[PDB]
Amino acid sequence: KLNNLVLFDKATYDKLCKEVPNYKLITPAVVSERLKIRGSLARAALQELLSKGLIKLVSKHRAQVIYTRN
Amino acid sequence: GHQQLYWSHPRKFGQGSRSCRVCSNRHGLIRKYGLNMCRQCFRQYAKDIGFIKLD
């Protein structure tokens, strides 16, 4: 019954650009749990921080994609 | 009946068209390889035909 964000508001986009790049593990299953966001943001959000180069792609698969701190 | 309805039902398919060539039965026919035997009369003659029971 938990409701998630389909889009970032201002106060969770701040945590995205601050808290998320400091993690030892960054994956859309973990990021969507800590930000309470729907799981299709967490793919689009981490393809956005990867384009900035604030994170590091370590593996990529159709099942899941794994990032880390930089 | 007379000549126009005594056997008038079409019998070009289905079980009404196909009979056992030995005992004139209509059920359990083996149509494979043109045997046209009911499966009881088949395994009576299966060695006379020459089907050797290996398994």
Binding site: - | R21, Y33, G34, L35, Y45, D48, I49, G50, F51
Partner: protein, 56 residues
């Protein structure tokens, strides 16, 4: 022409029906069997019995 998976079958149905009529017809004179010699020349059938003069 005919398929050879069908041809060996129908030859078996041949001598099975042949063996079954001669069993009913020659039941009284020691009939035992039929050997079949289908050839492109004359097809000979040898009827095996113990009372030849009643087969004849």
């Amino acid at each position: 022409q005919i398929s050879k998976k069908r041809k060996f079958v129908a030859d078996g149905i041949f001598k099975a029906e042949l063996n079954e009529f001669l069993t009913r017809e020659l039941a009284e004179d020691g009939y035992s069997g039929v050997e079949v010699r289908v050839t492109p020349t004359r097809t000979e059938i040898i009827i095996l019995a113990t009372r030849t003069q009643n087969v004849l």
